[PDB]
């Protein structure tokens, strides 16, 4: 149901907790978009766990990607937080948030994706059959089929004069896989959140006696 | 001597890397050095992709181009058992179960090639909207080969994801090292030892 | 919760960290933004280096800093044993073995964190000239407590290549989310979706 | 032991095979290398590969480091091959090129480190008792002393007015164990042999029919 997906994406100084309370935060924003996919919730719950786990994070970067096109060459994320790549670079995360720019919110802006596409795509990876210990791989593999065959309908619909949208769509995939494995070897997310407070408390801690 | 002969079989396996470059429609339409940077930023991608599906025949192991057969026990012998696993189950099974064929990866293999994420390129749109063609083609072979399957051409794009994170997590663990140089390598440094 | 007590012990052990490099001679001399460079360059293998030496009383496993003890078993079981293996192996056993005192791990870790290959530092030749005169320290100590022992200033200096290599293998790993933090996860987002 | 270090330091187109060639000549002069070095070939011959497997890398990097003081933000290969900054930055290994001229060649050229230095560095190198699979782990750490304390007493005898200098050649390891690290995993050495012949390979092979 396209319908119902597109629902789904519409709805002091004490620094490591407050970045995991961040990262909380964000993660419970997940699980509750990944709830009002429908079927997901009727999946076992172990199953949901590996599904969240194997896809988290290609989830956040496509929705701050998509996020980004309206801002200005740099990153917009969930919590307001407008980075730019001096930013990126200070944190030594530079080279991932070109990727960014270049082979996601680019491109998305080029071909205009919307937020129900976006909703398809992120539905698409988190029915991930691949994601290893799943009960039942083969029911996963068939929720990921009713997403994209509803995906490319919409696409058909919406788009008649291209017919080769539904296919470029499918095909920022890759890329989205690529720096999804990148951010996590950087510790991209919580890089970008947490080298402000991190420093600005070592700031005080080295200036105070 | 084995060392030799692995770095004689990756000449031959580039040669034939670049002459099927050449046959892909329009690629050599595009500059040189676009023509270049495609095949580096493709090579490895492109060589698992093939002996992927070179191994559905093969059980619980890979066939690399040469009659080389490599199984998994060794695979995890030599530390690499995970990503051989990924292989043996993200492709491999996958390419099998829904038996593709030599044209659908043809299709695909030419799909990872004309990559306009490629860094450098001059005329990233003009790779962009080759790779549109050779799938709008590729879709219009399985409209007609598999009517009854509508959802095989996503299906197909749809290992792509996989084969790009098996190819970098590949370059990572020392992939092909581990499971055809190693040995040679000891044989290799025992020669030199006993040189005078 | 499993979660928040993992970044309570994070917060603390950074305070912990802070404060130590604060009594460090010099320390707080150079400049503020040259101290916080060297502080994120170093925290890694100052932890390990850490935590490894107050494991030398414990047998086939480590004590992280809460009285959190990891086993083996349980490294393997996380998927990290040969990483948990290095460190026992290359710094705790060794540790162990040639009875490094606190005074003799305090300089080894002094000189960690006066790094001056740390990229960004303003003046790199005054944290150079500050780890000259800790390993001077460190040097002279070894000598009047153990002049029987004319190789060990040597000795422990030698460890820090192990702990250079360790430090950037843990962190490729995912060492300690492998082992402390994987199944906090996994209860984590169970409740998350247990939730209405 | 001091002086045998140093005598032992003193002493149409097909591109992979090209390279490899190369790699075995260059690998050649290490075994050579290695074997003049006293009480090495005493070792288990299963012990000496390892040591040189587990070393090769850094021996290498050690080697051309201390070739290239003479020159200007360049390294100076075996085969006479001036490598500059830029070319290795064009060839995606810009920043661990640097690296190696600012922790090794630039620190070296500073200390003035002699071949009999660079020597006794690779020996510590060479025998590394760290190295898994040794028959015999405690003969290889006996060996490594020997040698640093060798190292030691040619410092304190050549330069009397530099006490910390023997400290200050063992301190540059571990920065040669990291650079060491980060070359095997973006194929350093075989890129910058190897990005040349191949690129040629290829464009005369596009050109052709
Ligand atoms: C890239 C590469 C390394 C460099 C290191 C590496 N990177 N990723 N995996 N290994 C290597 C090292 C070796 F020893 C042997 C092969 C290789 C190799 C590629 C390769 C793959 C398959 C074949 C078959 C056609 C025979 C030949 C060469
Ligand atoms: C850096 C880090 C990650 C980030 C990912 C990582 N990098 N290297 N290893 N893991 C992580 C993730 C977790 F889940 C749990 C811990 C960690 C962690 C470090 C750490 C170590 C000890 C303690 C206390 C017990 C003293 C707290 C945090």
């Known amino acids: 149901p396209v319908e119902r997906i597109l629902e789904a994406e519409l709805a002091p100084n004490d620094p490591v907790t407050n970045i995991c309370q961040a990262a909380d935060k964000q993660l419970f924003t997940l699980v509750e978009w990944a709830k009002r996919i429908p079927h997901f919730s009727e999946l076992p719950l172990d199953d949901q766990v590996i599904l969240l786990r ?3 994070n290609e989830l956040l970067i496509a929705s701050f990607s998509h996020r980004s096109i309206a801002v200005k060459d740099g ?7 407008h980075v730019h790549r001096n930013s990126a670079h200070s944190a030594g995360v530079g080279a991932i948030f070109d990727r960014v720019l270049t082979e ?11 937020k129900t596409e976006l909703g398809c795509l992120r539905a698409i990876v988190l ?4 994601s290893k210990g799943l009960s039942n791989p ?20 919406k788009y008649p004069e291209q017919p080769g ?6 095909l920022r995939l890759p890329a989205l896989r690529s720096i999804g494995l990148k951010c996590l070897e950087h510790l991209f997310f919580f890089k970008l959140i947490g080298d402000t ?9 080295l200036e105070a006696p």
């Not at 029915?127 to 691949?130: K, T």
């Not at 009713?146 to 919409?154: F, I, N, P, R, W």
């Not at 949208?165 to 499918?170: C, D, T, Y």
């Not at 407070?197 to 801690?205: A, G, K, S, V």
């Open 75 to 81: 990153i917009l994320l969930a919590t307001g937080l």
């Open 138 to 157: 083969a029911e996963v593999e068939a929720l990921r089929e009713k997403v994209y065959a509803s995906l490319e309908a919409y696409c058909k619909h």
């Open 165 to 170: 949208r539904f296919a470029k769509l499918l």
């Open 197 to 205: 407070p991190i420093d600005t408390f070592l700031m005080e801690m």
């Open 127 to 130: 029915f991930n059959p691949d």
């Open 54 to 56: 194997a896809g988290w």
């Open 104 to 114: 996601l919110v680019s491109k998305m802006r080029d071909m205009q994706m919307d």
